[PDB]
Amino acid sequence: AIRKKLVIVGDGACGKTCLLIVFSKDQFPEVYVPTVFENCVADIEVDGKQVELALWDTAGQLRPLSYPDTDVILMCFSIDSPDSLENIPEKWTPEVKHFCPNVPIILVGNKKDLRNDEHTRRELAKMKQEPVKPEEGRDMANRIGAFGYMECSAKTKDGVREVFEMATRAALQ
Numbered sequence: 001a002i003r004k005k006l007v008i009v010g011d012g013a014c015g016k017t018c019l020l021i022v023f024s025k026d027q028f029p030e031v032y033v034p035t036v037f038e039n040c041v042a043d044i045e046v047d048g049k050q051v052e053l054a055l056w057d058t059a060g061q062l063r064p065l066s067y068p069d070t071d072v073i074l075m076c077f078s079i080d081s082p083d084s085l086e087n088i089p090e091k092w093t094p095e096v097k098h099f100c101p102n103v104p105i106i107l108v109g110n111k112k113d114l115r116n117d118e119h120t121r122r123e124l125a126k127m128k129q130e131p132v133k134p135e136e137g138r139d140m141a142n143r144i145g146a147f148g149y150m151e152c153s154a155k156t157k158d159g160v161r162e163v164f165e166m167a168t169r170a171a172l173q
């Protein structure tokens, strides 16, 4: 199998750990771990090629120790948090491109299921905000030079497989 290292970064609580666990175990977690700490390698097949994908979780609140030899980056925000999106160019892209200057980035909008959630929309409206729109994610992907923009929901599994398929294709370049 082809072996590739993936590192996932982004604001705390934007769904990184749940995304990794739903992809690798096909089950939304019932217990809380800040970062995946065991069994970090998942299999995936892309265009006939077997690829082993090592999944490196991070705390988004030492962290640069995860960056060496990375083959692809998942840079995440949450669709229920316009603030987590604004931290993409202000915090995460400067850090990732410093330690991983030419590693491909997939920009990922997590928690897609909350875009139409009424509690989410009510909480954001009291701050004069609304959920991130897909056109905003695409614009940000252009801004930071990401290989692609993907939306997903770890809760519903919608788009999860596609995120990692796109990341693997980017890593194989």
Ligand SMILES: Nc1nc2c(ncn2[C@@H]2O[C@H](COP(=O)(O)OP(=O)(O)O)[C@@H](O)[C@H]2O)c(=O)[nH]1
Pocket: 010, 011, 012, 013, 014, 015, 016, 017, 018, 019, 033, 034, 110, 111, 112, 113, 114, 152, 153, 154, 155, 156
């Ligand atoms: N509604 C919804 N909640 C999610 C989703 N993914 C993760 N979460 C919730 O969001 C919280 C933070 O998730 P976590 O993966 O630990 O975030 P991390 O700090 O970025 O690793 C937790 O309460 C999760 O249950 C999702 O896709 N949809």
Ligand SMILES: [Mg+2]
Pocket: 016, 017, 018, 033, 034, 035, 036, 057, 058
């Ligand atoms: Mg986590």
